[PDB]
Design a protein around this ligand. Structure first.
Ligand SMILES: *C(=O)[C@H]1NC[C@@](C)(O)[C@](O)([C@H](CC2CCCCC2)NC(=O)[C@H](Cc2ccc(OC)cc2)NC(=O)[C@H](CCO)NC(=O)CN2CCOCC2)O[C@@H]1C
Ligand SMILES: [Cl-]
Ligand SMILES: [Cl-]
Ligand SMILES: [Cl-]
Ligand SMILES: [Mg+2]
Ligand SMILES: [Mg+2]
Ligand SMILES: [Mg+2]
Ligand SMILES: [Mg+2]
Lengths: 243, 196, 244, 250, 204, 233, 244, 221
């Protein structure tokens, strides 16, 4: 009777507690991430926290290069994050081989979401305690943000935020898009779209960032790439000469 | 078919004719036999078109999945994947493939994989039915660390002779230049290479 | 391990009963009543639709009376979804027999096979039984007009008249009271409706809450005919018998 | 490793209840309201696009899905469960019918195939039932227009009109008043929009409402000309504009 | 050696004015030896007629298979299968055995019960559909039947006329083939009724 | 506490313990005592055989695995038979494929890895027996102690089973003496008999009670039982 | 309620996996082992508790080699560590067979990572009762990694796990601060010896044996080798001098 | 005889309408132009059953893929799926296809051989009439053709096959696929092989055929 909270079977209220507890694991890292769409680019910002002095800062990342075009930022424990990353990479490679064109952001998102849904219905598979935010400049839809969760839910976003202080970043971005009356950042260069994403990250969280406190990924036409510490510093110097 | 890859000072150049024949009929006179498996790793296909395409498609898949995980694969790594498919399926494959790629550390490299599925790293490699006629010419005229202009000439002269004698070879001479500068596509029409 | 969450659906109680079979029969006891009555010149199948609405399309609806063969039909009591799984396999077994022997399957052989599948879920596999009881109405050239019943235990028996689903105890008493061996189909149609009318948990027995089927050997032919009654045809026979 | 859950997770309780099916139906009741109305010359299926954030793009989430060019589906309950059922439903229409008979299945048979998939999740080892109820509206040459409900149990019933989810009890009552056997498709869309307005709390417009019809053949949507027998799909999803036009005559 | 030439036999189908006709010979032999003079090669599943030529064991096997499949179709669909639909079932059924095929030449004939449109079709042993408006031929005397049909046939023949045409097409083709003949049966199919006639032909 | 986390081997306790493994280790302590000790030239097994009745036989404790390797058991005899049979095959495989006598150290590594697989998978149970493997390979005399946990340790001497601590303390004291008994098998066996007799209490080791095995430089693994051990009592 | 810690793959209400956290206790219970990343390589060292004089000195080796360029040392259940290296060796062989080049350290790290993480997905398996410190030299420099029972791993300048991990980590932290230009392979071996001797004070009751291995581009040609004879004694003496 | 010709704003495929068993013409008007997706059309040569089966299978899988991804089918997808299937069967599925169509990425023209080799060109031809057609294409093809020029060239190429090849005959089927608009399928675009009126009517006087036995057949159940 009381085992309806151990495996992915329905509770009397029609709820899956293992799915709800999997959602709780996504905040274990205490990391906040947001994604915004430019005129012809997509930018993901994530907090980078290195507590141990013995850690190699270069190896600590929750942003993954899935394919040439698709990037993925994860909110959750790194073992589950890397499980989801390797699977997405494998699915992106296999898709290209079988269908003869690069897997679109939203199709990989749907596929990963369908996998998560199976763990939600089969008892022997647990859900992964992660939220996957996929970004690209799709060759049909243009700048694209698609996010999946342990429930197997997925949807496209104009912009999005994930983590403990998700709601603060969300409402901040909401209020900007109510004001601008558009569904993207009206800017030609990606550098200024990254500067926007960092600016509204600071405003919402109320925290100042050094070059080692942030982790940036940019998607453009036919490439997704992550910024180095020095690329971020150049970005932090630009926002400083405005405030 | 006449195919070759030549290492030079700045990198490597792949060259091929454009003729596909089913018997004595030229099924395609503008075939692209120079196939991309990675940004700066290309291969020359010879033998069964079906087999070499099936292999190249699988290799491109393997290197795309390699890149996703471990970053840019070496030209040697690409040749190893080609080898593994060719050797382990030697009974059901008629494929002779030259693998050529530009690495920033290793510069230009050429690997040749004949029918058996063996691997041979060479300064330059020639293959296909038309190659038999230019073993003499290529051995006498090849020098190491040639210029881009010199290497293009060596391949243009070599393949023109192969085309002239081999009925299974002909059409245009396609080349693909692999250097630090990037990837350059070259084409040379009969009205040029025939009168060398 | 997984042992923690195993219900063990195929075990005996200390009394020597099969828990899941007993609880499945309890499930069926709440399903809409279905009656079969065998006469000298045919068989009748009558069933009560459990839960209806003004907006339920009755014309395109079938939840109790299914056609297995050109000579065999079933009345369902329990999970409709479970019944459709067994009905589909029964339809196939009938066609396998016809393909093999070039003869229509004798009624008992079909019934035994379905009953043997139910018995399987009772002894091995660790799956829940099918929450279904069937009334088989059929004809073959060996035993003529036959009426069978099967339940989740995988046990089957033959009847002159029988009920399954809700209020079988009451329904079986009324049938045992008014049934005679020399009965005609038209007498059996009336008996079937009278019995349902008195065992119904609803206000009145209207046409929109009934499914009706007869298996008769129309004298002006010499062959067996299955008739699954249309809504208008149920409405008619309901007025003639004196229930309006 | 290996699925060692080879036993049923849905079992009969001493009362004769199947717990996991009852609990699945409870999950369906919590879901957003969706309805279906059958007219003389078409069928309409409608639901509310409950956007989980105003930053989210409600267009990139289709609650109403094409199964075949003449069959459409809408649900109430768990979205992910619906999404994989649509994927399986589209595939089974091909594998189990079109690849055999060279034509799309009739509504009742595709419904029957979806029903089977959901029944198997009720009996098969190491799985829970699907936490959705489907409304499948379709047309076929020999049955005309039809509307079916499919429940987690695997049970399905044909409807003239019905609703499922949150305010199904109130919505079913309102449909019983307004429905007749002489309704035109435009009258059914009007009744559908009226019924759904009682369910929606916030904004009620073309951007918050998802509505599709099974009506006449759309030769403009076929994508090719020259085959007279091919006249186009009967399934059409109404645009954001097309809904707002009918909302001014509410 | 050739399984299509062991038993022998022929089938021919023709369309007329609001009618179709399908005919076949009655011979079942083993090479030169004639065994049966009563082996019919035309079967019907509702209002859809199927004629099968080729290896006799496969003729009987496919008849039993299509009765099986049409019986299940009728129970699920709650209606008789139509000629166009049945044609697709035969095609997909034969191609299922692509690399181990039934050595047969099937012929579908019937009138679509809804549209009232006459329909015939022919197949190769692996199930390639040959949909002709005029006529279909199959069997050991297919060359002969093609010659007779191509000459005798004219469009929009009345049932009584179409009978004479298909009968003469079959009879004269059969008398030029060693492995065909030994009696014949013709089916005249209309919307409402179907007439079956046994032809008097040469018994050599 | 313990009652909830000892149902199977696939479950860790809150303190980080595997109780099913520890329960298997308990089956060894209940088993009859056996002693192992080696010099630089020879390795000796001395095992006390246990009887059910005075009418029963004394169950054999030493199994030969190859001409250069063998082991003594303490716990479930069938589990000793399974593991010894596996080790026989690995010794056999090494000979046929590589024409190579299997190194005693590598025999230990294989037993360790086989025991481990029974401690991480559901449905399986740990092996309920401890083994003392002796062997003379290319790197001289060897003695191993195997535990169902998967832990294998190379030692100069040791003992396992009931009252095994008596023999283990003696060997820990006699270490410097017996290590140097090189080219004298009889003195190494006598030193092993004096070791096992330190774990007696019930009876005195008799003729059909004592079981001794030896391997070394120019001695193939041979088992001495009955009359043959009379000159050591 | 409770019972969230009885099954492996089960999430607790606070989104934790208790079976993984219980495996960490088995690791914390185990011997102390370290890894030091020097300017052109990595050094591995481990404490070997001498149970009795009966243990043959220098024989019961704990540090394991993968391929010819990777060193692996672990703390906790030694058999579980051996099982992980067995997999790692199969994994490295698979990579080399297809791609020719010996497996990069990051590539190898994720390979162990995905395998350990897989033993937290199902209730039919137990999580690994070891934290593994591993690394070596590849195409582009030296790499040091530490892998937790959860499947979690990162790159490290220095790493420590087991009984005296705090003593170790504290001593490692001092080296990172006082050598920003980077420690040498020779120095890292001496330094590793000291940290093991200092971290042994959390288990000072039992006498212990020191075991060091290293993989340096200049000192071992980028191959994993064990520290033996003179260089081992020189390192033991450096530690024995600075313990007083 | 099947051909494909690229023009500046799309692609056209054409085919004859002769089906043969050995030297006998089985169908005088069979359609060799098949629809994979609404804007991807296929012309088939070789084993008749194989070309039809492989086109229907990939067509079915392409539809399911199109619904799954919520995108228009791509020609490179139909190409990759056909080549990988044909290759797996080592040429035992004797299908030789010219696959053409328009998709979001533009207009495409490919040929697929039975062993799973693919070619890309501006003009292609396959079948027994391949060489008769290719001779016309190699003579008249230029770069930047109009829609009307491409139909003319493609049609002329099939006519070369019909007249000069015994394997090919009867009528010309054409399908035009323009980047902007719906694909238009022109069944019997040309009918240059109409049968001349017969010299005599072979209508028999009723009662000509001798009948032994007559009976009405039972269709109704
Ligand atoms: C232009 O080049 C045309 N030339 C004519 C022709 C016949 O070569 C063909 O390729 C045509 C392709 C069309 C036919 C109409 C349906 C769509 C495909 N091919 C055939 O008609 C084909 C010829 C053929 C026969 C047999 C073999 O292998 C032995 C290869 C080619 N005919 C058939 O396949 C007939 C069916 C006709 O109803 N089948 C057989 O004879 C049965 N054998 C098939 C192989 O396996 C053994 C049984 O049209 C091109 C475009
Ligand atoms: Cl999927
Ligand atoms: Cl090619
Ligand atoms: Cl060649
Ligand atoms: Mg689960
Ligand atoms: Mg030439
Ligand atoms: Mg004759
Ligand atoms: Mg004769």
């Amino acid at each position: 009777a009381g085992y309806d909270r151990h495996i992915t079977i329905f509770s009397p209220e029609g709820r899956l507690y293992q799915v709800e507890y999997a959602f709780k694991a996504t905040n274990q890292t205490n990391i906040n991430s947001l994604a915004v769409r430019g005129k012809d680019c997509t930018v993901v910002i994530s907090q980078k926290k290195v507590p141990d002095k013995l850690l190699d800062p270069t190896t600590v990342s929750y942003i993954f290069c899935i394919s040439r075009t698709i990037g993925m930022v994860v909110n959750g424990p790194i073992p589950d994050a890397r499980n989801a990353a390797l699977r997405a990479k494998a699915e992106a490679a296999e898709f290209r081989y079988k269908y003869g064109y690069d897997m679109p952001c939203d199709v990989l998102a749907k596929r990963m979401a369908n996998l998560s849904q199976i763990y939600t219905q089969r008892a022997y598979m647990r859900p992964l305690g992660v939220i996957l935010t996929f970004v690209s400049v799709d060759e049909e839809l243009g700048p694209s943000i698609y996010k999946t969760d342990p429930a197997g839910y997925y949807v496209g976003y104009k912009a999005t935020a994930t983590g403990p202080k998700q709601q603060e970043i969300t409402t901040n971005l909401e209020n900007h898009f109510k004001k601008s009356k558009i569904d993207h950042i009206n800017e030609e260069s990606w550098e200024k779209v990254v500067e926007f994403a960092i600016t509204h990250m600071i405003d919402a969280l109320g925290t100042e960032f050094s070059k080692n406190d942030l982790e940036v990924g940019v998607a453009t036409k036919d490439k997704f790439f992550t910024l180095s510490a020095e690329n971020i510093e150049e970005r932090l110097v630009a926002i400083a000469e405005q405030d | 078919t006449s195919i070759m890859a030549v290492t030079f000072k700045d990198g490597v150049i792949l060259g091929a004719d454009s003729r596909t024949t089913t018997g004595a009929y030229i099924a395609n006179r503008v075939t692209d036999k120079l196939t991309r498996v990675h940004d700066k790793i290309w291969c020359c296909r010879s033998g069964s078109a079906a087999d070499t395409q099936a292999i190249a498609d699988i290799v491109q898949y393997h290197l795309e999945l390699y890149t996703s995980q471990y970053g840019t694969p070496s030209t040697e790594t690409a040749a190893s994947v080609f080898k593994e498919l060719c050797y382990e399926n030697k009974d059901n494959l008629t494929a002779g493939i030259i693998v050529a790629g530009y690495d920033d550390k290793n510069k230009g490299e050429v690997y040749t994989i004949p029918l058996g599925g063996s691997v041979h790293k060479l300064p330059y490699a020639i293959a296909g039915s038309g190659s038999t006629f230019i073993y003499g010419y290529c051995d006498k005229n090849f020098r190491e660390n040639m210029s881009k202009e010199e290497t293009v000439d060596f391949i243009k002269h070599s393949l023109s002779q192969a085309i002239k004698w081999d009925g299974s070879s002909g059409g245009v001479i396609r080349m693909v230049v692999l250097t630090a500068a990037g990837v350059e596509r070259l084409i040379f029409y009969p009205d040029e290479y025939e009168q060398l | 391990g997984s042992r923690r969450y195993d219900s063990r659906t195929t075990i005996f109680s200390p009394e020597g009963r099969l828990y899941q079979v007993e609880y499945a029969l309890e499930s069926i006891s709440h399903a809409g009543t279905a009656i079969g009555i065998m006469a000298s010149d045919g068989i009748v199948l009558a069933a009560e639709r459990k839960v209806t609405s003004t907006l339920l399309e009755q014309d395109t609806s079938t939840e109790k009376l299914y056609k297995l063969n050109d000579k065999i039909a079933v009345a369902v009591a329990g999970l409709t979804a479970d019944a459709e799984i067994l009905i589909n396999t029964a339809r196939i077994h009938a066609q396998n027999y016809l393909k093999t022997y070039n003869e229509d399957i004798p009624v008992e052989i079909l019934v035994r096979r379905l009953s043997d599948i139910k018995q399987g879920y009772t002894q091995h596999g660790g799956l829940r039984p099918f929450g279904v009881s069937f009334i088989y109405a059929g004809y073959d050239d060996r035993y003529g007009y036959q009426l069978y019943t099967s339940n989740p235990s995988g046990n089957y028996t033959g009847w002159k008249a029988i009920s399954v689903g809700a209020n079988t105890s009451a329904a079986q008493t009324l049938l045992q009271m008014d049934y005679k061996d020399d009965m005609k189909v038209d007498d059996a149609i009336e008996l079937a409706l009278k019995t349902l009318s008195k065992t119904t948990d609803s206000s009145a027995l209207t046409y929109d809450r009934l499914e009706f089927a007869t298996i008769r050997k129309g004298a002006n032919d010499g062959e067996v005919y299955q008739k699954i009654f249309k809504p208008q045809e149920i409405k008619d026979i309901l007025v003639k018998t004196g229930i309006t | 490793m290996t699925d060692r859950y080879s036993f049923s997770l849905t079992t009969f309780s001493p009362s004769g209840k199947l717990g996991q099916i009852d609990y699945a139906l409870t999950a369906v009741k919590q879901g957003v309201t969706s309805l279906g109305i059958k007219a003389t010359n078409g069928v309409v299926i409608a639901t509310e696009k409950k956007s989980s954030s105003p930053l989210a793009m409600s267009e990139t989430l289709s609650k109403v899905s094409l199964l075949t060019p003449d069959i459409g589906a809408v649900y109430s309950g768990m979205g992910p469960d619906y999404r994989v059922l649509v994927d399986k439903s589209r595939k089974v229409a091909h594998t189990s019918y079109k690849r055999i008979y060279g034509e799309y299945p009739p509504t009742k048979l595709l419904v029957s195939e979806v029903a089977k998939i959901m029944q198997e999740a009720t009996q098969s080892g190491g799985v829970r039932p699907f936490g959705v109820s489907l409304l499948i509206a379709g047309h076929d040459e020999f049955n005309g227009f039809s509307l079916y409900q499919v429940d987690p149990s695997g049970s399905y019933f044909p409807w003239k009109a019905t609703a499922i989810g949150k305010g199904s009890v109130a919505a079913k009552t309102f449909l019983e008043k307004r429905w007749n056997d002489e309704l035109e498709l435009e009258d059914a869309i009007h009744i559908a929009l009226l019924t759904l307005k009682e369910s929606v709390e916030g904004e009620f417009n073309g951007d918050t409402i998802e509505l599709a019809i099974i009506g006449d053949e759309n030769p403009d949507l076929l994508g090719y000309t020259g085959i007279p027998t091919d006249k186009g799909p009967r399934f059409r999803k109404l645009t954001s504009q097309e809904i707002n036009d009918r909302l001014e005559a509410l | 050696s050739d399984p299509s030439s062991i038993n022998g036999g022929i089938v021919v189908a023709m369309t007329g004015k609001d009618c179709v006709a399908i005919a076949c010979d009655l011979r079942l032999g083993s090479q030169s030896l004639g065994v049966s003079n009563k082996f019919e090669k035309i079967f019907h599943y509702g209002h859809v007629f199927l004629g099968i030529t080729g290896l006799a064991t496969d003729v009987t096997t496919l008849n039993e298979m299509f009765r099986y499949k049409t019986n299940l179709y009728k129970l699920k669909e709650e209606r008789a299968i139509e000629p166009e639909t049945f044609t697709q079932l035969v095609s997909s059924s034969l191609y299922e055995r692509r690399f181990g095929p039934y050595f047969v030449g099937p012929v579908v004939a019937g009138i679509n019960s809804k549209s009232g449109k006459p329909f015939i079709a022919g197949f190769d042993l692996i199930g390639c559909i040959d949909e002709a408006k005029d006529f279909i031929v199959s069997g050991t005397a297919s060359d002969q039947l093609f010659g007779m049909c191509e000459s005798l046939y004219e469009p929009n023949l009345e049932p009584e006329d179409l009978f004479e045409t298909i009968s003469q097409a079959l009879l004269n083709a059969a008398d030029r083939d060693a492995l065909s003949g030994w009696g014949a049966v013709v089916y005249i199919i209309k919307k409402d009724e179907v007439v079956k006639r046994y032809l008097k032909m040469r018994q050599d | 506490f313990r009652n909830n986390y000892d149902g199977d081997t696939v479950t860790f306790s809150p303190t980080g313990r595997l109780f099913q493994v520890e329960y298997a280790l308990e089956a060894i302590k209940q088993g009859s005592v056996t002693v192992g000790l080696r010099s630089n030239t020879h390795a000796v097994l001395v095992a006390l055989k246990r009887n059910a009745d005075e009418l029963s036989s004394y169950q054999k404790k030493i199994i030969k695995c190859d001409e250069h390797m063998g082991l003594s058991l303490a716990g479930l005899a069938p589990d000793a038979r399974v593991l010894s049979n596996y080790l026989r095959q690995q010794c056999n495989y090494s000979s046929l494929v590589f024409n190579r006598k299997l190194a005693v150290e590598r025999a230990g590594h294989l037993l360790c890895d086989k025991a481990q697989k029974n401690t991480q998978s559901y449905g399986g149970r740990p092996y309920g027996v401890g083994l003392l493997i002796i062997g003379y390979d290319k790197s001289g005399a060897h003695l191993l102690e195997f535990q169902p946990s998967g832990n294998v340790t190379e030692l100069y001497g040791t003992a396992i089973g009931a009252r095994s601590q008596g023999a283990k303390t003696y060997l820990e004291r006699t270490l410097d003496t017996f290590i140097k008994i090189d080219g004298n098998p009889d003195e190494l066996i006598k030193a092993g008999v004096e070791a096992i007799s330190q774990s007696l209490r019930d009876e005195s080791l008799t003729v059909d009670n004592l079981s001794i095995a030896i391997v070394g430089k120019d001695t193939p693994f041979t088992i001495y039982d009955g009359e043959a051990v009379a000159k050591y009592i | 309620g409770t019972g969230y810690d009885l099954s492996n793959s089960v999430f607790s209400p606070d989104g934790r996996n208790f079976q993984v956290e219980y495996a960490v206790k088995a690791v914390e219970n185990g011997t102390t082992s370290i890894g030091i990343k020097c300017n052109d390589g990595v050094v591995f060292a481990v404490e070997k508790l001498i149970t009795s004089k009966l243990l043959v000195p220098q024989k019961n080796v704990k540090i394991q080699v993968v391929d010819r360029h990777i060193g692996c040392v672990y703390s906790g259940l030694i058999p579980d560590g051996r099982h992980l290296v067995n997999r790692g060796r199969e994994e490295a062989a698979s990579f080399k067979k297809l791609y020719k080049t010996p497996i990069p350290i990051p590539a190898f790290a994720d390979r162990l990572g995905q395998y350990v993480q897989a033993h937290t997905l199902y209730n039919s398996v137990r999580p690994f009762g070891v934290s593994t410190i591993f690394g070596g030299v590849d195409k582009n420099g030296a790499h040091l990694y530490m892998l937790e029972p959860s499947g979690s791993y990162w790159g490290y300048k220095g790493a420590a796990t087991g009984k005296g991990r705090q003593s170790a980590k504290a001593e490692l932290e001092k080296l990172v601060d006082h050598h920003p230009e980077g420690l040498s392979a020779r120095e890292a071996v001496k330094q590793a010896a000291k940290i093991i001797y200092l971290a042994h004070e959390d288990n000072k009751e039992k006498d212990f044996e020191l075991e060091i291995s290293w993989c340096s581009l200049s000192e071992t040609n980028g191959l994993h080798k064990f520290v033996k004879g003179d260089l081992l004694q020189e390192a033991i003496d450096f530690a024995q001098k600075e313990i007083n | 005889t099947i051909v494909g010709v690229k023009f500046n704003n799309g692609v056209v495929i054409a085919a004859d309408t002769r089906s043969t068993q050995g030297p006998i013409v089985a169908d005088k008007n069979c359609a060799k132009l098949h629809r994979i997706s609404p804007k991807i059309w296929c012309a088939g040569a070789g084993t008749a059953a194989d070309t039809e089966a492989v086109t229907q299978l990939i067509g079915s899988n392409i539809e399911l893929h199109s619904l799954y991804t919520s995108r228009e089918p791509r020609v490179v997808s139909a190409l990759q799926m056909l080549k990988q299937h044909l290759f797996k069967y080592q040429g035992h599925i004797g299908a030789y296809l010219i696959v053409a169509g328009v998709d979001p990425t533009g207009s495409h023209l490919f040929s697929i051989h039975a062993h799973g080799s693919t070619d890309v060109g501006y003009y292609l031809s396959l079948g027994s009439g391949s060489l008769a057609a290719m001779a016309v294409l190699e003579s008249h093809w230029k770069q930047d053709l109009t829609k009307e020029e491409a139909i003319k060239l493609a049609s002329d190429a099939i006519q070369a096959g019909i007249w000069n090849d015994l394997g090919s005959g009867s009528n010309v089927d054409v399908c035009v696929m323009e980047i902007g608009k719906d694909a238009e399928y022109l069944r019997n675009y040309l009918t240059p092989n109409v049968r001349e009126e017969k010299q005599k009517s072979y209508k028999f006087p009723r009662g000509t055929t001798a009948v032994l036995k007559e009976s009405i057949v039972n269709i109704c159940d």
